[model samples]
Target: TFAYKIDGNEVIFTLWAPYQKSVKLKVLEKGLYEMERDEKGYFTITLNNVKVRDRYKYVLDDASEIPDPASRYQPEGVHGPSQIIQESKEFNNETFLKKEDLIIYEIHVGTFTPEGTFEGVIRKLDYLKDLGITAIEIMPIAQFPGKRDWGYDGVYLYAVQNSYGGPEGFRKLVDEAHKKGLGVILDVVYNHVGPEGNYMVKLGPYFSQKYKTPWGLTFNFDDAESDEVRKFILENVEYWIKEYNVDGFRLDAVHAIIDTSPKHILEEIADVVHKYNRIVIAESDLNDPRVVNPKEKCGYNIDAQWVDDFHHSIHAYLTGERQGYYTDFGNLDDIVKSYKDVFVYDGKYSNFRRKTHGEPVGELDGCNFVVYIQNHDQVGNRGKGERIIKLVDRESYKIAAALYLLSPYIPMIFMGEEYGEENPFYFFSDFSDSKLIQGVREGRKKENGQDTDPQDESTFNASKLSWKIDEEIFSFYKILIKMRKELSIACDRRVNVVNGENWLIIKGREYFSLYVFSKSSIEVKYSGTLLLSSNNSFPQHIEEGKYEFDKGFALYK
Candidate 1:
């Protein structure tokens, strides 16, 4: 279960296989050698001389040949032999941005640019910094099958996706980003492994029989021989921090990961990431505060978590759509709760869920929650992959952006969201198995209305960012971002939400925002100078001090 490392003069190769009677190490173009097996089912061999990168594999009981479970790079593909390469553990990085100062921009490397490689993201660092982005939350880049994917189908935890230029290019991206004073947050999938080239099952007890997940089998965290399984993921946490100078991790779908361990996998992971002062944010829909609460309060103490209520409330309310999860949202009250209470469904009955889903969000600070108006899942899950701008007009879109960005939480904008890229962020993949490919096509058709084949190259090609910007929207975003940082307001401030069913007002410490939500104008008495408006909807000369507007947002200081 240990990755090969150069020690003194010999390279120590280790493998954890408790079931196999015999194991051998096979190096291509070189002679094979027998490995020593321990009682705990570990096969290891240290040789005098080993090729640095001629490619290697493990032959199980002289029968099945498989790549290393802890490989770092797979140049050929997921099914190819594991190639070893020396990587730098140290980075000459500048000071990391504080939690409050982080303006995260989430992007998928495959579609963020035309090249769709780590270098592609690197080339855009100047543009990102100029756009007021302090960090870039990259979608997962773990090795999967074939060329393209939204990156959830990753099979090798340590191996970087070869198509996206692997670890070498990724290191360059992080280094360049740090040089430009930008933090890098990686999206990691711990809930389940991908279908193709999932060799962990054959190596050890990687999955559990007790719990089931729609995506894949639950990880055996508390089952028999769960110790090493926990160690595997924990080591990976340290590996990324030491190897790559990433600022934090966004754990994918923590709700799907079920573990009954005395010390939960999450707590252990938090402890490891904490040693390096790195954050471990969670992506969950359970609305449970324990996911973000500290260990002193009998919680996971994860750095932060993604809040979907904010996105759903704004999206559903603005678009007036009430389907699926949107059924529980679309209320003006939910919008207030997203800022005041943080959880709209806290101990409340959900019409879509048919039961009380979550506990109340009590004293936890707001910065522990990461809020957004749109993200990959929200946009890509749609049949046509429509963005928020596609559902609402420009003024409404700007209002939505203000509502989230001004809240007392870290705000994450999806790629191209700042200037309003209208391209669809469709869910796409490139698996080699024909049956799996066909199944994905048919399944996507059933899940989403239209079947725009996810396997088609055009699907991936279609999602690329246009790199075009609307001057009005772009200028609005720059001013909003500048104001939020200069005012220093969204840092756990005492927010007071006041509203009728149609209109709402969120009063922060240094500023207050008046949001007119109805079609007809509503006369409201207010104070402070009008600092910003949604867009052209702002009155040029409506009797000074009147902040008059039809139905849009206006911020005052």
Candidate 2:
């Protein structure tokens, strides 16, 4: 069940093949050994030493040699033999972050730096810390087919991306991040495995046709012979959590997973994660509060989930782009409602879904949701894959940043955004199949007709961050983040939001934020010390109750 256990002196390997007549362990240099099957169809064999290989394969019923389903490392790519992995030294750090204090920096390991490897990310950790980032959420690093990919195509759930420094490199990254007082969160995909190098079905019914997802058949979590499949996924969670020691996870597309079991797999995962006191966040399109609600109330008890309405409200309001999902947004009240009640579509009519979506997020704190202005999915899915800065002016960007960063919810900054990165993060990859490559191009054409070929080296390299920063924009972000951390009421959601058609005044116990979205500036009457403003020409008090319109907005305390 633990895959293969190494007691240091001797080792035991286990494999599950219910329909197979026989099974054999092919260890490099050592002779092949027959595995004894149990009543439950588990074939296991105890060997004298470890099965370290360039290096090990499971021979099924005198037929083809295949890599173990629980491979720890695929050094020569997905089709190659599996390599035994030794766990790194254990570490403990109390300085690790809490949920409320999390100012996450989302990074694609390949594009976040010049080197495009785990070591490259380590070099930038100090830069992130200086920018007031509490944790760095790395995109998926599981083993894919080729060198360059966005990582959603990961086929090996246990192995880290061999191209991006693999197991040794990842262990060091987590160790160094913890040492720097920065928590590490990994983005993982469990909804569907990738197309290329997917040997899962050959092994068993790791997938099921009874239920469907965006990619195709859903994982066989509720179908017949699904317990072993569930065991594989749950154990993969353990391997990553226990072996690497990450602080949290950002589960990709949990809404796509279908399980009819009374005890859902998500609940099982939550129990496993909570045992070690680690956080687990989900990226769900579903605005259902049940994602974060307690299991006693039939919820998954996830630490938090990404809320996209906040982004949509701001995006459509500023840009006026009414295509796709943005058609349901663009109202000022959407922003105001989201400040207190995090969901805009909670039990409301949705033009996008053509049906009522989401239930009321009752009694859930703002910390139960994560807010972001620009993220990988938002920018990368666009036709041009443009960053938010590319869509709006610098002033508008600052206003949006200030609004969310100071909100009660957790904040996440996409990599290169803090310093006003303008580079586009396109959907880039390096797959090998000719048919799959053509299909990808055709699909991308429906989105970005002239979109860069995902298989090209230029497309992957073009997405890399330039590392150049506009000092004004950098200072703007730093000041807002610094102000949010330094002020206690910045995270308080029980504030008064005095709103009008043109401006908004969100008043905390000791502080108030003045926001003006339009060109027309009306004089404010609140008397307080000026904290900070995006525009220096912000109005100031001239006399007792009189104030001059310096024609700008600012925060006051």
Candidate 3:
């Protein structure tokens, strides 16, 4: 049993299990407070107005004292104690702005910094904001079993991980980021909970074996006693937005969540989010437009979706990775198609899938699709954890970034990608269970190719971002972001190609951005402003017309 009451500024908490009878509130500030039990077997107490940053935990009426089930902000940790959050500065109850102007930076909390803590990442706000990224999309931060794991292994969906500075530390980070004019987008996994720390299995039918995932059991969205599970997920979403001041959410692996209700869980979720004016994006491997289409016409009504086709086309062409899904996207025409439309495989045969994938995305704005040259899955899932920089030339790397950022679709940058950070975001875990650890290790190694053991500690060790900035990479990214901010033509997401193939002329108002990617270097005279260059030695006097180039890439406004 769990209950709580508010008396003045103090809060009295209670939890009862017939097996135990006594409990103590181990307050971090003035010491532990003893609680008295009533006839109902509930332990309760009330303290004076507690100050912020105060950590507390319940000594469960017995020898066993566990972390608070509803711990909002944990400064110390899950085992240590729960701390009162100073409250969010950025994500509050305020209405979220529309998702029109979004430049997202998808980040992994554990690998984002050397310290791998929320407070540590706060130090990088200036760098991210200056890079013209409007929103920070953090990977899941919910509590798992051990000290280290990608937060996607979340078991306690309502609590923050103890390793990532707990809940309070995360609040401070989000608040500080918001104060810096950056919105926070949390990646949430609702499809299937991790195998470890999954107490929900004992509580109810949280999962079902009817539909299996690469992970163990799938979530029981369409089974008996599923309403409660669905409620739990929805309430968790609400709690983050309402309590943490989170601006939006990127639902993870949505295709794995199975539901057959007329009012689907996703539909209801969108209804709830739109009612609060908060954005809800989905991660669906399925490229069906129905996921993002309006609900009135049998659609899921999600706001935006991950545009893998766009990324795949750019990645395949630039990096020449013809294996797996890259097989369908190598030709220059595919890039043109992805830019003009949104998906390259929109009703086309996919050599990788051995079947036609995706349907037409009719009249949808580019803002509804998020395109990126590389993301966590693209790099980290690879056998060697090679980023696009490792696969392509320096000029092509910059060219790919330019194309991704300037396209009509919403753009997202992977962590350290702007600076061409050489670190590999490889598979890592601190799973204590021997059986599960072996499974995860084998799965990661066998996913693509066999080069190194996924269980190697060095894989995770190499993923940390290096703070030492490479001047060349830094200058390249800075110039691109500056061009994005200063140039109006670059801001337009709608792509217009007047010509094709050799001289790929992209016409925009005020000026045009041209891409002559072919065997020979072709020079075309264009009347426009020369904002930046990938090959320029100095940012100085450079006449626009008749500029010659070797077998490399260029960016012109």
Candidate 4:
């Protein structure tokens, strides 16, 4: 039994596990009186007006001091002392940020900054705002089994990651970001709990073997005790927005969320979320518009989804690595159709899946979908984690950057992508449990065979962000970010790209930008001003857009 009493401005708290009844509130301050229990198996005490920032803990009956159960925010961690924080006044959900001008920079807390904490990342707010990234989508920060993780294997749905400076640090980060004009989105995983230190199963049937997922046993979304499980998920979503002061959530791998009912979990989750006026973005592999369609039409009613086809088309064309699912891409038709219709391989034969896969996303708004050339999974999945910068030339990098930022779809920059940081964001862990470690190793080998040798610790070391930002490549990235920020044509989503075999021209409302890629060295003619280039020393007239195309492609703005 848990009990508390509000005495004046101070409150006394206690919990009784009748099996063992010794308890204490471990107070560091003197003159704070401990209270006696009332008839209701409760304890009470009153101290004078307790000031914010008071640090204390509940020394349970078992001679062990535990953190408060109702702590609003923890500065240290679950194992550390709890500090009373000034209740947050920096939270609101009145209006949604405009979608057209939104630029999202996705970051992993552990690898984003040298200090690897929310406060550390907050120090770079000016840089992100200056770079014109309107929204920041932080990879999961919920508490997992260990001190460090990629954040995908989260277990605690409520507590923030202690290694990343916990909940108060996150509040400060968000408060400062909002002041700097950036919306915050937290990427949350609800499909399955991690394989380690999961306490939810002990609480109840929070999971089910009824439905299996690619990652693990599906969450019990439609079982006898599933209402509570769904409630638990919704409560966490509410906690992110209400408690953590986040702007939105990017639901990870939603297709694997096995729920079969008239009122599906996604639909109910969306309905509950919109009630609080918060946004929910889904990472669905389905490529179906029904996910984003209105609820009346039996849809999920999510805000947006990741467009993998766009990534596939670009990846296949650039890298020419035709292994695995890349076998379905690389054709010019796919590239053209990808821009025309959001899903290039919609309802088409999939060589990888060995069947027709995915449905069309016809006439869907580009702002609702995110397109990127390289992200964490795509780059990190390689045999040795390699970024696009390492695989392609400088010129091709520039072209891809131009295409990614200036295209109609909403663009997402993975951490260090803008500066083309060379660090490989590889799979890493520090699990002490031998069985768990073996399970992870086996899973990695069977799924991708892309793991570095466990003994060579470079796997984790390679993922840390290199803060040195003055290099030539970094300068190029800064230039690209500036171009994307200044060019209104780049931000506008209501546009179309007209592509020929070797040339593509994107037409926005008031202006047009063109891109040309040729197999051999050749000069291209253009009619518009040259905004940027990777090459130098062309004819001054041609470089200034005064000359016509002799060969190659020209991007006109």
TM-score of each: 0.96, 0.95, 0.84, 0.82
- Arranged by lDDT, best first: 1, 2, 3, 4
Q: How well is each residue in 524-546 modelled by candidate 4, as lDDT tens digits?
A: 33345555555542233333332
User: After best superposition, candidate 1 residue 343: deviation in angstroms?
Assistant: 0.5
| Candidate 2: residue pairs that collide | none
Off by over 4 Å in 2: 51-54, 89-95, 447-450, 489-491, 521-525, 540-553
Per-residue accuracy of model 2 over 298-363 as CA lDDT, tens digit each: 898888899998889888887878888998888888888888788888888898889897878877
Off by over 4 Å in 1: 91-95, 519-525, 536-548
What's the lDDT for residue 134 in model 1? 81
Query: In model 3, which runs have C-alpha deviations exceeding 4 angstroms?
Result: 1-98, 450-456, 489-493, 498-503, 519-526, 537-549, 555-557
Ranking by TM-score: 1, 2, 3, 4
lDDT of 1 by residue, 279-338 (tens): 879998898999888888888989888889888898899998998999999988888887
Off by over 4 Å in 4: 1-90, 451-457, 470-487, 490-496, 519-526, 537-554
**Top lDDT hit:** 1
Clashing pairs in 3: 22-61, 23-61, 73-168, 74-167, 89-175, 91-245, 92-245, 408-493
Return the lDDT, model 2, position 33.
79
C-alpha root-mean-square deviation, each candidate: 2.0, 2.1, 5.1, 5.5
